[PDB]
Amino acid sequence: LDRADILYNIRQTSRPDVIPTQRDRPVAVSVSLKFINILEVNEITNEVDVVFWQQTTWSDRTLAWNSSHSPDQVSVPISSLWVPDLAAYNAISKPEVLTPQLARVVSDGEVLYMPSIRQRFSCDVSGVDTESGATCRIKIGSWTHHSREISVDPTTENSDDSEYFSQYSRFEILDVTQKKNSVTYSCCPEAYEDVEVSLNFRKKGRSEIL
Amino acid sequence: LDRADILYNIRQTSRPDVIPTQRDRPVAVSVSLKFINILEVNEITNEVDVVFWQQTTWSDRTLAWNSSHSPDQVSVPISSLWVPDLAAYNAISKPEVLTPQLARVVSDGEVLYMPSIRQRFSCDVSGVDTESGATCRIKIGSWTHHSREISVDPTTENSDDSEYFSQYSRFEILDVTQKKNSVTYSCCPEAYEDVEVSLNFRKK
Amino acid sequence: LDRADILYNIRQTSRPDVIPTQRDRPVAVSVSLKFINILEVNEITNEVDVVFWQQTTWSDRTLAWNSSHSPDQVSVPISSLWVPDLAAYNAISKPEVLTPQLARVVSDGEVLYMPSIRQRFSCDVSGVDTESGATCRIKIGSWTHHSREISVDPTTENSDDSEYFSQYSRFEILDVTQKKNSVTYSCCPEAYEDVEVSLNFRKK
Amino acid sequence: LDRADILYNIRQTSRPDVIPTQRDRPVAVSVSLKFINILEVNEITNEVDVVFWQQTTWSDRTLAWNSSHSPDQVSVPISSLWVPDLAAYNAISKPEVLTPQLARVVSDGEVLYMPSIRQRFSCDVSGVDTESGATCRIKIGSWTHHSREISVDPTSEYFSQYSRFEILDVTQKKNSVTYSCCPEAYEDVEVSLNFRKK
Amino acid sequence: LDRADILYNIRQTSRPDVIPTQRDRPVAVSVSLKFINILEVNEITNEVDVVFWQQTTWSDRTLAWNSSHSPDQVSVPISSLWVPDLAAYNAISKPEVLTPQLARVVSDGEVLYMPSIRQRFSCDVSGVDTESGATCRIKIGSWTHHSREISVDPTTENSDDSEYFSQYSRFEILDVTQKKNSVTYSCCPEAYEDVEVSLNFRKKGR
């Protein structure tokens, strides 16, 4: 098989609307935000404008192929793949996707989708201009799939938090932590999972001694 | 049947442009706003910028399937389903849909579509900075289907007003009430139904 | 026939790009603006931001069906229908369509398309803060179809001008009048019709 | 033939991606801006916000039909037609197309596309508040078709009496320019808009 | 062959989702920004609003045709072509594409896509109002293709930095330089290439 064959097969047979549940177990989705920039902050309105890579990971066996004498990976338009219906609960704007909408697919069916996104959130901005900084909590989970269909988990807890964060922001990141939750909503009997990402950041210029 | 089969069947026989009217009974549509945030308020212009979940519920029997030894529910792109043509009469901006446009479909044909929406409205903002607060009235109904085709049912089950309302808003919700109306418009002989949602809120 | 059949038949044979002229006749289009709100006004720049229903009416016999034992009307996506290419000549922004893009089609081929639209216009704002008010003139007609192909006419429902107008606007409507014109443009030899809607309003 | 037939034929044999070249000659495109309004001007930033009709004209013989006892003209969605890939070089926003995207097609293959467009430009705004006014120069031409493929040629009437600005004069100039990317020359029309604040 | 035939053949066979890798070489992509305008600058927030032509070049042999007694080049909608998935890493707004989305394709398979783009970036604006000016660094590379699949190189080191730059901007360009990098990201074992374009500019008027 060559890349053309693999992509043909995927385009023809992937079922983008079909969640790749295996043996009635939930699709395990890993989610992780890599913060790139903090553009605007409003301590009056408690709103923040942020850029981050939404590193998203899951397995879809229907995409798999025999790679013994073939490419190990391909890039695939997400329009040709099932993607988790993740949403930020406290987002107050549509996700502005900054990057080409392609996912990386490995021959065993592992998928990595990691778009860079600019989005505004409603969260706690108080203390942003102090040493202690503010802690903006961002809640992400499947909008319509409950816990027997999608589970969400934070990816690896090890990584430079500012690895990709802009040195030119007026802000700096003090700490990023992630927490998993399972919540019942009044609309529905089922529990839905989410990841809460706590972004601890401050404005540059209040850790001064002199 | 597995999920792939069900979704295949729905996609193939989906008639998204066909209202699932049963024996010339109107399609009963339930509508409910769960307020998430109040972003901007202008007492001069009487305009508010709001985020809410638009919980929308109705039955479409053409979607139903035998779930004996099959999944009980699936998520479906609304592009594959008929959806009520609801509109907010006093909205002054296009609905900004914040969330993935999927509905939840139960095997008996019950549909739940509940997008998070940001939208601006023209309404009464006076008193927003008093302890009595302002009462912003939002009117939602079918744009083109009269009461013999769509009825809008304003009843809510188990929901507290601020249940999903952001603790970080400059505003707090005092009360949310819903009222059903049936209105005749000069263009047309038929009555069209709407739900009016009265949002009583104030600045913290 | 049921709704599914009717909508199927329409989708399969509508021909959205084909103006439904019968014999030697223009398609008669009725146009009428029902003002809902006046959001922003600038007396310096002579610009206004307005919300209105653009009530649009015409007949397309190719849509017609025998309604003997069948539904008398259906809602149809305008993407499946021929629609008049109307434009506001003095609009300075794209029409922001606020409502679901469906038209109402009667079994005899009569179509009613009435979206709510927000749009900015260049017009005379002088006097807006006086008792006499300002008179903003809005010009609407077919962009590409001359008078032998499309005729436009004011339809009046002599409803209240303020019938659907928001009580929460900072403005009030004093009067709305409509005038029909036939104009020749230097580009082309034929006359093109338009309706001029004169909105007389003032600041409260 | 009736309108339905003609539009059917055009839709079915529409090669919107195929430039209607005949005999190795360039498609002659006429362009002309009819200014409707000048909405915002910034003399500090040298930016103007303008509304104009972009009157665009060319011939496509593949659209032609025998109009013996048939309609002489039809309106056609531009999605069903080849359209010149014109762009304003000094535009700083996407063209906002205000009008229905239909072209008028005559039975001999002549096409007239004339949308009303709102767009912002970078140009010389200095002098706008003098009696001499400012002269904002707008440069339009095929983005990807050189002069052997597309030639461009020029062709207060419709200008709003309610604008804060008035037009003193409009002149058009044709140019042929070579760009460092490519060996061929690309043609453009430069429209000079002389206007002032009332 | 005439233009209609060529375009038909391309549309019918081009495979837009398939990277035209030849014999396990990466597709060599050249990228170069020709700056047209600098519209807004914010030295407090370190954000700039810029217009530039994103001159993008690569070879796709599957597009090739015999051009004996045929046209040597055609313009093709990019929707009918595979295009590199380039992105500016420090862009803070979606690319606003100002121009018709057509690429120029030569009969040997060489492609030139050069849209004019308006986009906002996060970069170093400090010094913009000095004689020395600011240097805004813009990082562009394949979002999902590593170095064995896409290599990126500056179209050239030899250029007039200001040939198409607007004389009506409030800013002037002092210098443009380009640097190639190969970076490993914590998500993945492979290296991804980028071009860093350093825009040295200042506000006019000393």
Ligand SMILES: c1cncc(N2CCCNCC2)c1
């Ligand atoms: C079903 C269909 N559409 C949306 C939801 N919800 C409530 C459960 C958790 N996700 C947010 C919206 C549930």
Ligand SMILES: c1cncc(N2CCCNCC2)c1
């Ligand atoms: C028919 C076609 N399009 C819109 C309407 N209306 C009048 C009925 C109530 N809904 C608002 C618009 C009616």
Ligand SMILES: c1cncc(N2CCCNCC2)c1
């Ligand atoms: C033909 C094709 N495109 C636009 C027009 N016009 C001129 C006739 C009056 N209508 C406005 C635009 C005519």
Ligand SMILES: c1cncc(N2CCCNCC2)c1
């Ligand atoms: C070829 C492909 N893409 C863009 C261009 N150019 C240079 C020729 C003149 N038009 C501007 C862009 C040429």
Ligand SMILES: c1cncc(N2CCCNCC2)c1
């Ligand atoms: C694979 C799939 N999606 C995103 C990436 N990345 C990391 C490699 C460098 N490019 C940015 C995003 C890689």
